[PDB]
Write a structure and sequence with these properties.
The PDB classes it as chaperone. The structure is cut from a larger assembly and holds 3 copies of chain A. With about 70 residues, chain A is an all-alpha fold. Chain A contains 4 helices and no strands.
Chain lengths: ~70, ~60, ~70
């Protein structure tokens, strides 16, 4: 078994650990990844929600409550 | 094989092959997927470690 | 010094470097050359020991301990 990462997904995984440590948390919830990944210039995730339907201003608001 | 009398032990071997299928990025299951499944069994990993192939060397 | 190699000699030194990857090694030690030659059936190193009267089992154990 082997695990190989890229460049865009690598910086997002390392950024999720720093966000959970600066807010005094215990577990690494998966909701701490989509927030940092969305805040990117010309990100690939922004065009997904705008193509398959759904407003991008209401989905992100539901991640901060978690 | 002498110690042993669908097989109940075969169900665990086929279940481990599905886990390795989602590792090497293969949509199907070939011969290489069944090789790593034998090392996960506690009653089968001792044979490979007897000749001179440890966990890191495998 | 002019230390030119033949076609058969390059096939052994190049294979000895890749042989140490499976045995967990980070260096190319000269003791790995005799191990690769003994792992091949009907090799040149094995035919020499048969004419000089030498046990190939005791020799393989010596290079394995190093």
């Amino acid at each position: 078994s082997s695990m190989q990462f890229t460049d865009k997904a690598t910086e997002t995984l390392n950024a999720a650990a720093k966000y959970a440590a600066e807010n005094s948390h215990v577990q690494l919830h998966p909701s701490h990844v989509a927030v940092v990944m969305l805040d990117e210039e010309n990100s690939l995730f922004r065009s997904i929600l705008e193509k398959a339907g759904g407003d991008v201003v209401s989905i992100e608001r539901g991640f901060k409550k978690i | 094989m002498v110690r042993q009398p669908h097989s109940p032990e075969l169900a665990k071997l086929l279940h481990y092959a599905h886990e390795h299928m989602k590792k090497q990025r293969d949509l199907y299951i070939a011969q290489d997927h069944l090789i790593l499944a034998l090392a996960d069994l506690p009653s089968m990993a001792q044979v490979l470690k007897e000749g001179g192939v440890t966990k890191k060397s495998l």
